[PDB]
Amino acid sequence: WIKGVLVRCMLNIWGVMLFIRLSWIVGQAGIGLSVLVIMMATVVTTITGLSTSAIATNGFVRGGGAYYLISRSLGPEFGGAIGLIFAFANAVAVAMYVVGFAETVVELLKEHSILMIDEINDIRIIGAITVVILLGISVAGMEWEAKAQIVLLVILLLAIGDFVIGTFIPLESKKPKGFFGYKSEIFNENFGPDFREEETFFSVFAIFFPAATGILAGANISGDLADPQSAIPKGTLLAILITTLVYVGIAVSVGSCVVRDATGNVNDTIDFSSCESSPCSYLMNNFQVMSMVSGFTPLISAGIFSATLSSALASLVSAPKIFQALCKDNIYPAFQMFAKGYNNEPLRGYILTFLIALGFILIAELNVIAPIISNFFLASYALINFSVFHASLAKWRPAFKYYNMWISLLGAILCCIVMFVINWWAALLTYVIVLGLYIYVTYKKP
Amino acid sequence: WIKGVLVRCMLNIWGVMLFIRLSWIVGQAGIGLSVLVIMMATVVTTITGLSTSAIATNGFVRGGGAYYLISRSLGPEFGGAIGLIFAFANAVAVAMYVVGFAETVVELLKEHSILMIDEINDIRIIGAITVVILLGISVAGMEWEAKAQIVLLVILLLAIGDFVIGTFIPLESKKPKGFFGYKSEIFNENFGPDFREEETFFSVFAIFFPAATGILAGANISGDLADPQSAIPKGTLLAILITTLVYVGIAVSVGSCVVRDATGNVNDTIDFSSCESSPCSYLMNNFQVMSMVSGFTPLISAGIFSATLSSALASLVSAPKIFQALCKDNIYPAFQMFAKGYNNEPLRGYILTFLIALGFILIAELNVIAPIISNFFLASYALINFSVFHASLAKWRPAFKYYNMWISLLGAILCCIVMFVINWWAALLTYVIVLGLYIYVTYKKP
Ligand SMILES: CCCCCCCCCCCCCCCC(=O)O
Ligand SMILES: CCCCCCCCCCCCCCCC(=O)O
Ligand SMILES: CCCCCCCCCCCCCCCC(=O)O
Ligand SMILES: CCCCCCCCCCCCCCCC(=O)O
């Protein structure tokens, strides 16, 4: 059924980079290039969506999810490499979605005069106490996670709704903080880039790319939904069409409404803003110096609480339940510890992904963590888009998930050169890893 | 016989970067790091020497040379990729060794007041008229090229000999040009780096690496020498031991003898030089601004004429005679034109390597051309050092060319990460090329 695969994907790709960093990305690269970031990051994942819909099309592989169907259709050589890369990418994405949860709690406790230890040392405290109570949800409560998640999405569509219903209001006491209407003087200004002290185009692309990346969570269940052949193809390619048309409609709206670099004080007019207020260049309540812009009705603070905890919970249950099936096929013999669990729940893999999330959570900057999430998600999407081409050349019958051609090769080049433009010495290292884990698997005795 | 395989290798690796750029390299990176450049560039080619000696060890493949023995021992999948990479690297190295021939002719015609067109536009003229009279040697005269080359090497060992016999002389009228004896004040100064406006360690490594790279020219004949199994292993690994102990003995001698940044005029003493002369920082006859240092007896100008023409002639006869056998196995069907010739001489491949040399010769800077020679020579040595490991894992019997272990893998990593530190977007492109030319060959019907 589509309504249990579209929700689990559309709720996973609406994450942390929608409210608290998309204004920063449309502030750095303007409007005309940020929409190009949306379109390039949605081409590079709609080719992967076509490919992972063509994977789930061929056979009646009902058991397992997102590892049982990409391994038994494409061979253990690619299936053992993707089963480590994607299971590590979900182990670090949970650290990303929790530092994004913590830095909007400490910046809400900065209001009303609350300081725990320091400015960014309390991010480590809240990120410590968040993951240990996400393990309490991941271990025990599974009936309350799959059920009652539409209530965890309708309070996110209300957060989109009051945001759009608030940016048409006047709010005359809010224009010192940069808020305005829809004037042409502010759209014509925000159309070009004003790149900051170090950020370039591919830098803000690396920051943005984890906002369009959880599309395999729809296909990450197949022993749970009925008729998995029909559902996966249209509930993955339709969540992308909703989410990209929400990202463009938010980036163009918040770009044509709030002016960059404007502080909040008493000022008057009587040639950049050309409006009733005037500011200085060499700000705190601006559009490029604070990360949380809000029209009105502050349940956007609740709209974070359902956009970052839900996508972190869906990437904490999903890394050891892939890594367990990887260690059950016994492809890598050094990892054979991580298959014994307590209802087939791996509790000794939860400790491993807890240590990985706790290691990558102690660095308390989201703009440092997001490129090394966008590294491994491209290093798994390139392996999917290339392994389907390699099965198309070393003849697996695709059975038409609306496009299963050899244009996926073009989606495996764009996941490769863009992964090297962003931090080339970390793409070299992961391609040496995924070539060594290919040669080790193809030349072993089994 | 060793005396016809050691000469053809030792004369090919003594090339352009010995007299006219090794002083610049020991001037940039000092003495203590330039010897590390020698040692790293000789480790990364002695692993390749062990590997290409283990290739020539297995069978009695008497016909052909350096393509017949690396293809029929390692398979057409690696043999068709190395047969293009190495045959293009020799097609651009002939442009390198002729711009190095031309810029020491125009800097000798700058003395005695001769200007043809401009300062570096006459390099293009002399490089144009040099390659067209190297094609006259390559096509017609082959008996005078193989015979009478010891006379083309003894006038190079005389150029080393009078250089060493000249740097012990006083030459009191030459010390304004920076020449001195062997003082401790000049050795202690030249021990550390004084990197220029853009050059780093791997930049001067990229400049130096074509000085230690023609070691496959010994194994590039096997239908010409008797008993090729015995000779190749010890005439390749012994030319490297001579040439590295000449490079170190030249770099430490010219580094401890001539001071950097000293102009030639009338000066006197009465704390950098601490000698009888004194100069200013903000030079023409110095050690880092002129490329040709000379002790005495100017037949070093003849010592260029046998070090750069001989190594360019040996890389003009060797690119189409590899590419012809590649186009005779008909692995790549689009290249099937380049096999018909006039005594089996390919004349329509000479036109192709003439156009490649003429294309890369019109850029008249040696420091631009040398990194894109050191790119493709590392991209062929990595494929040799990895294809021997891949035949060691996909079981070809090595028969002990004194080391044929799986340490060659370590020589295929060091040819890979150092090829990416130098100009990463040109190593990415050539690894996509050599992976596409692997997948095209392994999945074709034959
Ligand atoms: C940097 C350029 C791409 C790097 C490639 C990383 C590792 C990919 C592994 C795929 C190799 C498989 C090729 C076909 C092998 C076969 O035919 O058996
Ligand atoms: C042209 C390619 C050069 C780059 C080399 C990439 C890294 C190769 C690593 C391969 C490791 C193979 C390990 C095999 C272990 C075993 O067989 O037990
Ligand atoms: C950038 C990292 C290394 C890139 C390697 C480029 C391609 C050279 C090796 C080709 C793949 C060889 C794998 C052999 C596996 C098999 O066929 O069994
Ligand atoms: C790990 C993925 C990296 C992607 C790198 C892919 C490099 C390009 C491969 C091109 C293969 C072309 C095969 C041609 C097939 C044919 O024409 O028969």
Author numbering:
A (entry chain A), B (entry chain B): 287 to 556, 573 to 584, 586 to 645, 648 to 700, 704 to 754
Question: Can you provide the manuscript's text about this entry?
Answer:
Cation-chloride cotransporters (CCC) are central to the regulation of intracellular Cl− concentration and have key physiological roles in neuronal excitability, trans-epithelial salt and water movement, and regulation of cell volume. The CCCs are strictly electroneutral transporters, NKCCs transporting two Cl− ions coupled to the movement of one Na+ and one K+, whereas NCC and KCC couple the movement of one Cl− ion and either Na+ or K+ respectively. All CCCs are feedback-regulated by the concentration of intracellular Cl−—this is mediated by the WNK (kinase with no lysine)-SPAK/OSR1 (SPS1-related proline/alanine-rich kinase/oxidative stress-responsive kinase 1) signaling pathway. Here, using single-particle cryo-electron microscopy (cryo-EM), we report the structures of human NKCC1 (hNKCC1a) and mouse KCC2 (mKCC2a) at 3.5 and 3.8 Å resolution, respectively.
The final model of hNKCC1 was primarily focused on the transmembrane and extracellular regions from the high-resolution map, although we were also able to determine the overall structure of hNKCC1 including the dimeric C termini from a medium resolution map. We have strong evidence that both of our structures represent inactive states. In the case of hNKCC1, we analyzed phosphorylation of the N terminus using a phospho-specific antibody—as shown in Supplementary Fig. 6a, there is no detectable phosphorylation of the protein as prepared for cryo-EM, and from extensive previous reports, we, therefore, know that this protein must be inactive. Like in DrNKCC140 and hKCC139, we note densities within the cleft at the dimer interface and we attribute these to four lipid molecules with lipid tails in the hydrophobic cavity contributed by TM residues, and hydrophilic heads facing intracellularly. In our inward-open structure of hNKCC1, extracellular access to the pore is blocked by the side chain carbonyl of E389 from TM3 interacting with the side chain amino group of R307 of TM1b and by L671 from TM10 —the narrowest open radius of this potential “gate” is ~1 Å. To test the importance of these residues we examined the transport activity of hNKCC1 mutants. Mutation of any of these residues resulted in Cl− transport activity that is <20% of wild-type activity, with changes in R307 and E389 being particularly impactful; on the other hand, mutagenesis of neighboring E670 has little effect on function. At the intracellular end of the inward-open pore, it is noteworthy that R358 from ICL1 interacts with D632 from adjacent TM8. The most populated Na+ binding site is defined by backbone carbonyls including L297, W300 in TM1, A610 in TM8, and hydroxyl oxygen atoms of S613 and S614 in TM8 —this site (S1) accounts for 40.6% of TM domain Na+ binding sites in the simulation data.
